[PDB]
Amino acid sequence: ADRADILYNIRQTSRPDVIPTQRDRPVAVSVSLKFINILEVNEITNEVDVVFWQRTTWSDRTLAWDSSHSPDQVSVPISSLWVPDLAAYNAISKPEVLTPQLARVVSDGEVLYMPSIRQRFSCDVSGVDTESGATCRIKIGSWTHHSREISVDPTTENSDDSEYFSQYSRFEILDVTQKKNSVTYSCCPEAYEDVEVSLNFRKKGRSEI
Amino acid sequence: ADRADILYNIRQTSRPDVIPTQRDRPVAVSVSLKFINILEVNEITNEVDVVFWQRTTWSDRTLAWDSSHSPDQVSVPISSLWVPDLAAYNAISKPEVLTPQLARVVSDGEVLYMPSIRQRFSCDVSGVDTESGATCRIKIGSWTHHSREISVDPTTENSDDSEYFSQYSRFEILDVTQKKNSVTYSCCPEAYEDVEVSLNFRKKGRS
Amino acid sequence: AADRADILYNIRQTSRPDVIPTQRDRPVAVSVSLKFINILEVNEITNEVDVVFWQRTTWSDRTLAWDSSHSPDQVSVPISSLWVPDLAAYNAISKPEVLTPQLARVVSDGEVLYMPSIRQRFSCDVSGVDTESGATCRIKIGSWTHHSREISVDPTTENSDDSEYFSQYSRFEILDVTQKKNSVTYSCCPEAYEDVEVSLNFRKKGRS
Amino acid sequence: ADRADILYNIRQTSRPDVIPTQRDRPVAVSVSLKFINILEVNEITNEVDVVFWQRTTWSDRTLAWDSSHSPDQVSVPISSLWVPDLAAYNAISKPEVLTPQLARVVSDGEVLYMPSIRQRFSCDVSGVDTESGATCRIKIGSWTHHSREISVDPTTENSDDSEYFSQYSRFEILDVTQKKNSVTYSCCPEAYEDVEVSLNFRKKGRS
Amino acid sequence: ADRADILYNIRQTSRPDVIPTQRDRPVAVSVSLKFINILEVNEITNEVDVVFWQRTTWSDRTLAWDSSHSPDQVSVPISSLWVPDLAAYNAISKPEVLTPQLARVVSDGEVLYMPSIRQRFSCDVSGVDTESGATCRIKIGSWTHHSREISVDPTTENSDDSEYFSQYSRFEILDVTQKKNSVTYSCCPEAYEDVEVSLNFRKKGRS
Numbered sequence A: 001a002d003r004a005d006i007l008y009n010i011r012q013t014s015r016p017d018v019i020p021t022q023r024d025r026p027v028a029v030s031v032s033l034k035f036i037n038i039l040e041v042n043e044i045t046n047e048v049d050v051v052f053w054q055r056t057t058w059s060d061r062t063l064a065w066d067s068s069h070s071p072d073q074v075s076v077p078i079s080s081l082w083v084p085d086l087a088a089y090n091a092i093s094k095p096e097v098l099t100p101q102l103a104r105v106v107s108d109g110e111v112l113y114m115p116s117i118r119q120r121f122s123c124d125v126s127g128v129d130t131e132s133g134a135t136c137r138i139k140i141g142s143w144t145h146h147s148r149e150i151s152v153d154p155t156t157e158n159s160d161d162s163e164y165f166s167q168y169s170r171f172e173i174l175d176v177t178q179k180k181n182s183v184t185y186s187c188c189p190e191a192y193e194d195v196e197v198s199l200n201f202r203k204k205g206r207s208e209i
Numbered sequence B, D, E: 001a002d003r004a005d006i007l008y009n010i011r012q013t014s015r016p017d018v019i020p021t022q023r024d025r026p027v028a029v030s031v032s033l034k035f036i037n038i039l040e041v042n043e044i045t046n047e048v049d050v051v052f053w054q055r056t057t058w059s060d061r062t063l064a065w066d067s068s069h070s071p072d073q074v075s076v077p078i079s080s081l082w083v084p085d086l087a088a089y090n091a092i093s094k095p096e097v098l099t100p101q102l103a104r105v106v107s108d109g110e111v112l113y114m115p116s117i118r119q120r121f122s123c124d125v126s127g128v129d130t131e132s133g134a135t136c137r138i139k140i141g142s143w144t145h146h147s148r149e150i151s152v153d154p155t156t157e158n159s160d161d162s163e164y165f166s167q168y169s170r171f172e173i174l175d176v177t178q179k180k181n182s183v184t185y186s187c188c189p190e191a192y193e194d195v196e197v198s199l200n201f202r203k204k205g206r207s
Numbered sequence C: 001a002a003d004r005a006d007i008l009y010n011i012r013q014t015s016r017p018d019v020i021p022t023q024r025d026r027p028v029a030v031s032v033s034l035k036f037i038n039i040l041e042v043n044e045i046t047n048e049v050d051v052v053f054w055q056r057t058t059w060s061d062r063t064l065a066w067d068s069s070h071s072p073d074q075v076s077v078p079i080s081s082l083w084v085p086d087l088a089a090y091n092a093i094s095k096p097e098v099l100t101p102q103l104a105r106v107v108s109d110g111e112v113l114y115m116p117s118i119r120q121r122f123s124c125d126v127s128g129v130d131t132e133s134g135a136t137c138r139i140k141i142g143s144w145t146h147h148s149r150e151i152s153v154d155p156t157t158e159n160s161d162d163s164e165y166f167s168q169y170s171r172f173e174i175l176d177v178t179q180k181k182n183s184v185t186y187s188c189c190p191e192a193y194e195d196v197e198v199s200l201n202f203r204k205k206g207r208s
Ligand SMILES: O=[N+]([O-])/C=C1\NCCN1Cc1ccc(Cl)nc1
Pocket: A053, A102, A103, A104, A112, A113, A114, A115, E143, E144, E185, E186, E187, E188, E192
């Protein structure tokens, strides 16, 4: 079959509001952040505008097909498949999606979605104009799916932090580290996993002593 | 059955425009605010910009299913469900929902919806810069349903008021008290239950 | 023996959201009454005011009536399932920000009430806002496409305390509010358009 | 028949995505503007904010009905009708439609749509503070329909230029002239018509 | 055959969510930007605000029809057609489309979509206040379709960069070059084609 088939058959088996739990185990969702820009820093309100590619991967076997005589990958609108309800806990604005909202689907069910998002956060901005720089931490995890339904882990990949960071930004990234956590709230006895991304950055062109 | 059948049935029996009233009693809705941040405050205009989690709970028995051998909790888009028409009587901006608009439904018909919201209000800001701080009161209750259709009560959760409040904020929380109240309009005898959330806060300082 | 669901269903099957509920030929009599709640961004230089008001809108569609002797007399219904007056604030300079859930209240006699809380910017006389006499900002609301024979507006001059629901925390206070009614004829359509002109007399607070 | 029947037919015959070409002639679209306010002038960046009524008329015979035993005209949501894809060429902000998006359809097929729009334009603001004022020119015409598909002409009237212009604006209209124009693009050999509206305005003097 | 049939047929054959690939050769999409305005520029943050016409073209054979006795072109809502998933790799604000979202389709299946877009970008603004000016580069290409699926090339046509540029802008265009280019991301092998538009502009001012 061709691509027109693959989409047709995907539109059938897929249920965008039904999380693809396999057997009985959380859907493993990987979240890796690639910072592109730092636009508005306010050391007085501790708020920063950030631009980043949120690489998100997970598997949905209800999507898998045979790619022997058909493409191994196709681009699909995210409104046509289940997507993790991730949220940035310390975000103070809705996530502004800058790119077309298409996901990449492989015939084995692996799914990739990597939007470029622009968002404002509440975090530690103090130190931004100092050698050590400021460290702003961003918490991302599912909003309604606890640890047994969704587990989030930082796609561990020793990659250059400023690999895609605009060379024209007033800031420079000193260092980015992705960590995994687990919070239990009052509503429920089960834990909610998340990933803390600590972005260490500072202003460029500071005077030397 | 699996999560798909559950979600299938929920979607097939849910009446998003009909208030789920069992018998003649109103729908019991619980509303609890958890302050996450205080973004901008203006003492001169008595206006504040705040972020909070609006824990909301109610019941809809028609949605219930047998969880003997199946999941007894699923995530559901609120557009597929009846949701209480709550409004902040003193909000000067429409609520900005920052999180995925999904509710959580237990097999017993209990529905939990807790959106993180950013919204501006017209309240008393005086004293924000004093040790006593200021006390901004926020009233939330149904907009069109009165006491016989919807009852509102604070989810008494003896917990820390700053448990989830941002440490990087410029303000700090002195105390939060959520009291049950009621509003009435000249035209009519009917009353609308609400919850008065008193946020006692002040600007961080050591002087 | 009808539950709210049966009530809504009968409404959804007879109400025509895009069709004005005209009786015979007579125009649909709409009532418009504003209740001010707050006055925010005021500018005497540019003559622009930011206001929050409850816009009480009432009319009737008897085809939606039912017997409430042993059933609910009213129900809340999404305005999208109903026909609603195409009202517009003529001197507004920003589209209205509806702060409340967009639900209407339909009564068993066919009466329909819709009261959204609205935040909207207006172009009006702001001079003297800081004088004992204050400023008088006039707001004109009326149908945008329905002329006097299809829709008529009546300011429900339900004498009340003008600042009854007005924010105490506002930097301003209401001195007096007056509901007026007017009619205009544009070079498009022979018959006139009816509107209600609300005069808002307010001023900056300050002990003196 | 009744208004509901009329709206029923319209929804049936009308093809909102198809231009109502009579015979094989282009659809004649009259465009006229009635300035209501001038809000955010900036003589440095040559940008202005304007509120205006865009009187737009045209014909769509495939919507006509027998008004012998029925109303002559009705209000219709523009989503149920084909509408000219007009764009203000020098606009720098999307149009902010401040009014209910209903058009007026007459029995013969005449359509009138007049939204109040607020939009920011890039044009000559120089001299706004002088006595002769400035002259900002706004160009409005179809975006994808050329001369042989759509023709636009300024249907002027006997109305005063500031007949509906707010007296509370910091600016006053000195004169408005609306000329028809025509441009050819690399796209294709056929040109596109547009109305060019010139607004001569100035900041109000002092006592 | 009239326009009603052409659109009706498009609605029957068009797959807006399926890339119209001929056999296995990538879809040939042409991009070229026409600068209309430069509204804001920050010498310190290296950010510009601009307005441009993004002339885009490609082939969709399944849309073809016979125009021997009907029109060979029609304006169609892009929501009824597959559209290239282009994105500006260095944009810091999502595109604000200023014009009606209608594409033009020729009887031979060729599609032309030219929206006027206002968008914010991160690029080199240094030298913008000098005679040689600054050079801001904008990279545009598919977001998810690598080279084997989509190829992008500039409509390299000798012309006047300032042809449709606003005379009321505070800036002026000195030269615009559009080069093809590609980008491969560590992860995966396949590369993503893109068009690199270099805008050489400067602040205008006799001195
Ligand atoms: O960094 N990457 O690995 C990949 C990319 N970065 C920018 C565009 N890009 C290609 C891409 C592939 C799949 C998806 Cl779902 N989204 C984007």
